[PDB]
Curated annotation (Swiss-Prot):
The lineage of its organism: Eukaryota, Metazoa, Chordata, Craniata, Vertebrata. The active form is probably a homotrimer. Binds UBQLN1 and UBQLN2. Interacts with the 26S proteasome. Interacts with BPY2. Interacts with HIF1AN, MAPK6 and NEURL4; interaction with MAPK6 may be mediated by NEURL4. Interacts with the proteasomal subunit PSMD4. Interacts with ESR1 and WBP2. Interacts with BMAL1. Interacts with ARC. The chain holds residues 12 to 87 of 875 of the full protein. It is found in: Cytoplasm; Nucleus. This is Ubiquitin-protein ligase E3A. A cysteine residue is required for ubiquitin-thioester formation.
Length: 87
């Protein structure tokens, strides 16, 4: 049919059984990634926003959401600079 109406164990679950599980792990990463993803295309709203990776820069220059999502991944792994930290 269209979708296997199930969400159990000891049964013939599809390969999508692992998908719903794996996304939870990387969703934790996504929470920090959103800071960079939004910073790249949306911005921050800061005076000292002048960062290599920012939309809210005093230059007013940004990227598209696809360009920002892939780069936010690349910023997550290096832990890039962020106008909204926590002391
Ligand atoms: Zn910024």
């Amino acid at each position: 049919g269209s979708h296997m109406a199930t969400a159990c164990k000891r049964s013939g679950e599809p390969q999508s059984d692992d998908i719903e599980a794996s996304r939870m792990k990387r969703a934790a990463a996504k929470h920090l990634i959103e800071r960079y993803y939004h910073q790249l295309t949306e911005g921050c709203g800061n005076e000292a926003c002048t960062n290599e990776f920012c939309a809210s820069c005093p230059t007013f220059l940004r990227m598209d959401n696809n360009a920002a999502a892939i780069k936010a991944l690349e910023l997550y792994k290096i832990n890039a600079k962020l106008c909204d930290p926590h002391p």
